[PDB]
Every structure is written in C-alpha cells, then in structure tokens.
Amino acid sequence: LYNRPCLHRLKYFLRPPVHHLFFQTLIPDKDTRENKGQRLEPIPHRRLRMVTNTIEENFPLGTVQFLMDFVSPQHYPPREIVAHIIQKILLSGSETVDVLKEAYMLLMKIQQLHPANAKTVEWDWKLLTYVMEEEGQTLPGRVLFLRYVVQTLEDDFQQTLRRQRQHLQQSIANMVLSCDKQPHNVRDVIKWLVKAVTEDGLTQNLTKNTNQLIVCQLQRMLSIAVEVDRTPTCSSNKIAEMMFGFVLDIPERSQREMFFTTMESHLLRCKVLEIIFLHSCETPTRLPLSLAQALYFLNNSTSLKSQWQTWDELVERLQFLLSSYQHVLREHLRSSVIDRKDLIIKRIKPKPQQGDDITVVDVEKQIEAFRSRLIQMLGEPLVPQLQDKVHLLKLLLFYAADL
Amino acid sequence: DAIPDHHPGEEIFNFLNSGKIFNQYTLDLRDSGFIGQSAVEKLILKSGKTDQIFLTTQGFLTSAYHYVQCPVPVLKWLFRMMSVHTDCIVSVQILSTLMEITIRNDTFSDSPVWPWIPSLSDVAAVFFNMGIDFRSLFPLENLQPDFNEDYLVSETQTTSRSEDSSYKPIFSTLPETNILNVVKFLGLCTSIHPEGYQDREIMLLILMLFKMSLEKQLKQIPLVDFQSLLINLMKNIRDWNTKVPELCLGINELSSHPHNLLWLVQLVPNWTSRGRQLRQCLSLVIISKLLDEKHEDVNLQVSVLHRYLVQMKPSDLLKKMVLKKKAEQPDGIIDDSLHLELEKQAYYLTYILLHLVGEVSCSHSFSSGQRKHFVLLCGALEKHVKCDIREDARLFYRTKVKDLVARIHGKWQEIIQNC
C-alpha cells in the first residue's frame, strides 16, 4: 500500500541509457518542486574571473577542480566554459588519463544538475565528425566524448518528450539527427558503425571492449533517429535501404552476427531482414509482414564455406525476425512516440493482423518440408549445431503467437 | 613523488579466489522448476542451454511477460547471469531485460509482494563470487550482518543444484562491466522501492560500497553511478540525524592511510543537503582522528579548528614524528636522508589536513560574527602555517603546500567579502 510514484513517465523509452541520472527527476512532489524554487544564475563574476585566471596558466587540473567546487544547484558555468573544458582539455591529446577522469566527472555533474537543452549544447556535428572520422588522431578521450554525446541526446529526447505535448521542434535530436533534414549524418553514422564492426581483433582484448561500447552507442543513436520524426515507418524504411548495401558486403560471418545481435531498434532489424530475404528469394512475395510471411521466406528463400554454415545463418536470421516481429506487435512501435505515450497510459490492447491465421499443423508441415529440403540439398546427418538451431526454430514457430 | 596527487588504493579483489560459487556454465533457468502450463514455461523447460541466453538477450522474456509477474527465481537467475557473464554486450542486454521486466511488472504488480530487489544475502553472494572476502565486504566488527559466510555459500550452492574442473578465475581482470551493471540495478531498485531495505541494511550497504571503491585497479574508471546510488541510499534512511555519527565513524575506521580517507571524503556527492552534512561531519571526525587528539566527544568549532591549525605546524609535526621514530628506532639516530623522508611524510600529512580544513570550512549559513572567525582563520593560515613555510625552489612540495594555502586564503577572502 506504499504510495508508488507516477511510474508512467518511465515507460516511454525503456531502452538502456548510459547513466540513470533520471532517477533524480522522478519525484513530482515537495522535494524537487522546492529544490527548483530558486531561480538559477551563472557563476559569479569574481568566481568567473578566478577560473579564467586558472585557464590562463595552462593548469587544467586546477581548472577542473575549481569548476567542480563552484558548480552548484544555484549556478551553472557559462557556455564558453563548457566549450573550453570539452575542446581544450577533454579532447586534448597530451595530458594524462586522470585529467580525463576529472573532466568526465565535471561534465556528468553539470549534466546531472543542469539539463542541457538545444540553446545550450556545446558540441556540434562537425566536432563529432572530426573526433571520429579524421583518423591519424588516437584521442584517449574519444570514448568519453561519445558517451557524453549519447547521454546528452537521451536526456534531451526524454525531457522534450515529457514537456511538449504536440511538437518536438526544440530538441537536439530533431536538429542534429532527423533523417529528412540531415540524412547525410545518418549515412555517416551507419558508415562508422560498419567500420567499427569490421575492425579486426577477433580471430580463432581491452580495445575490443572499446569497440563494443562505441558500437552500442552508435546503435543507440540509430534507435533514437528512428523515432525523432513523427512516423517511425518511413524513417525505418529509409534507414534500412541505406544500410542494406553496406551490410551486404561485410566479409565474414561473426561480424554480421555482431551487427544483428546489437540491433536496438526492433523495426529497423525487422526491415533489414525482410529486405535481405526478399532480395534473396527468386519469386517475390506480395504478402505483408506477418507469420505467414515468415513461412513464405522459410519456404522460398535460398543461399545468397560448406553451405550448412549458410543455412545456419539463415536460421538465426529467421529467429531474429520472429523475435522482432513479436516485439513490434506487442509494443505498437508503428505509431508515433508522442501518441504512443497516451496509448501506453490508456493501456489499450493490440489487435490481430492479416496473415497471422495459421495452426500447429501448418507449422509442423512447413518444418518437415524444410527438413526434407535440407536433407535433399545436403544429406544427413546434419551438423549437431545445425540440428540444435533447427530444433530451436521449431519451438519458436510452435510458439506461433498462440493466442 | 613526494606528494602523489591521488589515493594509492589497495588490493581488495583477489583473482585466484574469484568465482568460488558459480559461473556461466552452471546457471540454468531450467533447474529452477515450475509447473509448466503456459507456453512460456513449456518452451523454457523444453529449450536447450544456449537457447536460454539467446532468449534472454533478444527480449523473449520481455515479450512473454507483458501481463504476468515473472517468477522470483527467474529474476534471481537473471541477476546472477548479469553478474557473472564475461561478455560485455550480453551482460548489458541482460541488465536491460531485468530493468524492463521489473518496471513492467511493477506497473502491473500492485500485489503486496513488492518488486523483487536483491536482499543483502544476494548482493553479498554476487560480490563474494567476484572475489571479495567477507571481512572486506564488512570490515567493521562493531557492525556485522545477520548471517555468516558459510550460510551464504551453502545456500547459494545447494540452490544451484565444482572441483570437477580446475578452478580457473571467472575473471582474470577487474570485472568492471559486471560491477557497473550490479550497481546500476541496485540504484534502480533503491529508487523505485525506497522502503525495501532496513536502516541497518542501508548502513551495511554504504560500508561495503565505500570499501569496494578503494580498489587498486578501479582507479581509472569513473564511478558516477556509485554517486547516484549513494544519493538514493542517503535519501532512503529514516532516522538521519541519529544515524549520521555512526556512519561517520564507520567510514573513518575502514582504513589507515590518510590519503584514502581524503578520497572517500571527496567521493561522496555534495549537491544534496544530507551529502553536505555527511561530508562536513566526516571531515571533522577525520581531523580529530589524525591529529592524535583524544576522542573527547568532538562557534566552539572555531576554537577547535584554531587548535588544529596550531597542531598542523609542519615543524611541530616533524618533531613529533622525530620523537616517535626515535622511540621506535632502537638507536634513535636519523640521517639527513631519513630526515628528509620524514619531512616528505609530514608535508604529505599537512597537505591532507589543509584539504580537510578546506572542505569543513565551507558552509552556507553565517551570522555576522562569523566574519571574525574567518578573519582569525585566514590569519592562522598566514601565521600558524604560512610563516613557518619557507619557500625553496629546489623543493617543489613546499611550493605545492604554499599554493594550496594561497587558494584556501583566496576562497575564504572571497566568501568574507561576499557580505
């Protein structure tokens, strides 16, 4: 019988952020309301003077310390100070790691206490491009810079989604990641993602984690991009077509597995798999996306290294497709986010979709048919791993969205 | 370096003893055992072993748990996996699944059974599996948990229905990712269900978290979520004023090296009232301890700080340590080299003390008469500290301490003139 808070505000974007500072803004009660009471201000003139003095003598550690002591809930650093700390120190390629440590703590404190908005952001896409693409610069602070960027984007998206009931014209994502307006940026981030995945290091360790984290961050940016506009469907289609060719030419398999596994936007993975499957099938299919379509691909698909590995790969692709299909059906991702909020608050139920009218007999017959086809084209006994994978697909289909 | 700028740290984790309970080759949700009637459970118990991880990562449980509470052992095994899995992406995905299922259930779980949150037994289990000793988890004999190590080990092992394989460490290097997910989940549960823990439990959690932070190989990894969880826990306690001094003494008692104590003073958050209270009280306790002052139930703070400053005269402490070492040393003869070494030690100690004075002095409420105290305070720094400091170009540590005193003087002067 405890007075739970208004948990509804947490359902809007359940996907993982980098940090959970949002827990400090849940309470819509006396504590937070009275804390916000005072009107904010900038760093006092004299304090500003001393901190700039600290800047002058090229003693970055003193600057970070003094800023840490001065930043408080009733004051914020002027934008110039934020730009200085980020560009001058964080991405400086000379100092030691501890300086980057303190810088990260400083930025995190600023972001935790003051929610950055569009009119106050520091970095620009040009700087991101410089740090990422312009190789020949191995900046130790690159990972932290990317983490800060993604955290800023996520915070801004959440705040704008909460505040604005009929628009999103004042969000960082809107003006730095909208596919309609800056599609070249989307292309560049996809290129960076495929580059990072392709970066060797796996064959038959510390930097592997770096690539993994940056890849997760890029996937987060893609996921937010897929929602920034009003209609997820068109943006997802655009993104899927731009990434189809890039995913096509990935040399090895494990890279493709990492690419698909890390996928965050469920609709994006669904579209990518659907497009590749259709491109890999001789006879096109006009049936919309549904379980019937899953069986359609299962039957009429082919291979686009002994072939059993390829068939294994297709099995995994179909399981991914079924998982993402279930997720989209249950989450109602098709609608916009702004009205999806009202949908989830009202807790309206989904509805059956055309092409989902199948029975257990159908799936059993289809699975037996595929088993026969695989034996015919390869023989028996199948590889034990392949056996396990087909068995797993059998159970997943038997799920059959049994209603 | 005569004065290193960061706490040295210490070896808390031991790799060769990391993972004595369970690993990823031992946890399966099949062994939990439930009446299989829904397609969810039937599929799970008919599913293989790797299909288990596949189902977890791709949100199959989240898909299958939109209107039904997830059984508690399922969440417990998910927590275990998040804690023990080596790969980073799988661990992050498992944590995401845990957050999603917990939030959804809570939004639909109005039943008296509150959302599952790892009891101290669970967190102790995971951390000990990581390679933290019981005393390391709880190093204050005065405050100890409600159980013992053997109970935890036997219960967790028997629940996990093994010398067969030569025990390799589950992690040959700091499991940063797993620790981060564990603390993130802890913060989530603390923030969603505040009254889920008891005051004593909260205190034990604070003690173990602070002790863990002192890890040697964790110096380079920013512990922001540590601060977030600290904020939540400090906010959770119900008898605050009464509980503050006990906690302060507890943190004081964790270790001996003063720079580590300075670290823990710095690490606590300082943008919430209770955080500031903790900071100032902990600083008072530390300054009382280090100066060899008898713990006689420590405006009067003005005279107490003046007394301290008198005691922190570098020459005075130098001679005090000279006396102590001469008594300890069977001969009692100190060479110029060892004299200079003790000089470094005394300068280090004074550096730490001036830092603590800087932290304690900060305050937001002041009466007019407080001016005089500050006027005296700076004077003492100028008189009881600055004058005895003689600049020597070849000796940089003197310059460091002098500049530190200069910064303190500047801040105090600015505060004074603010009126």
Author numbering:
A (entry chain A): 425 to 628, 654 to 753, 760 to 858
B (entry chain B): 733 to 893, 897 to 1033, 1038 to 1158
Paper excerpt:
To evaluate the accuracy of the predicted structures, we performed cryo-EM single-particle analysis on the SIMC1284-SLF2CTD complex. 3D reconstruction yielded an anisotropic and low-quality map, resolving side-chain densities of only bulky residues in the protein core. Nonetheless, the predicted SIMC1-SLF2 model could be docked into the map unambiguously and refined to ~3.9 Å resolution. The refined structure was strikingly similar to the predictions, with r.m.s.d.s of only ~1 Å for Cα atoms, validating the accuracy of the predicted structures. The cryo-EM structure contains 425–858 aa of SIMC1 and 733–1158 aa of SLF2. SIMC1 and SLF2 α-solenoids face each other in a head-to-tail fashion through the concave surfaces of their slightly curved shapes. Overall, the ellipsoid-shaped SIMC1-SLF2 structure resembles the Nse5/6 structure. A notable feature of the SIMC1-SLF2 structure is that the most N-terminal region (425–467 aa) of SIMC1 preceding its α-solenoid adopts an extended conformation, and a short region (431–451 aa) within it adopts a loop-like conformation that inserts into a cleft between the curved SIMC1 and SLF2 α-solenoids. The loop contributes directly to the formation of the SIMC1-SLF2 interface; without this loop, the α-solenoids’ interface would bury a surface area of only ~1500 Å2, but the complete interface including the loop buries ~2500 Å2.
The human SMC5/6 complex is a conserved guardian of genome stability and an emerging component of antiviral responses. Here, we identify a novel SMC5/6 subunit called SIMC1 that contains SUMO interacting motifs (SIMs) and an Nse5-like domain. SIMC1’s Nse5-like domain binds to the putative Nse6 orthologue SLF2 to form an anti-parallel helical dimer resembling the yeast Nse5/6 structure. Thus, two Nse5/6-like complexes with distinct recruitment domains control human SMC5/6 localization.
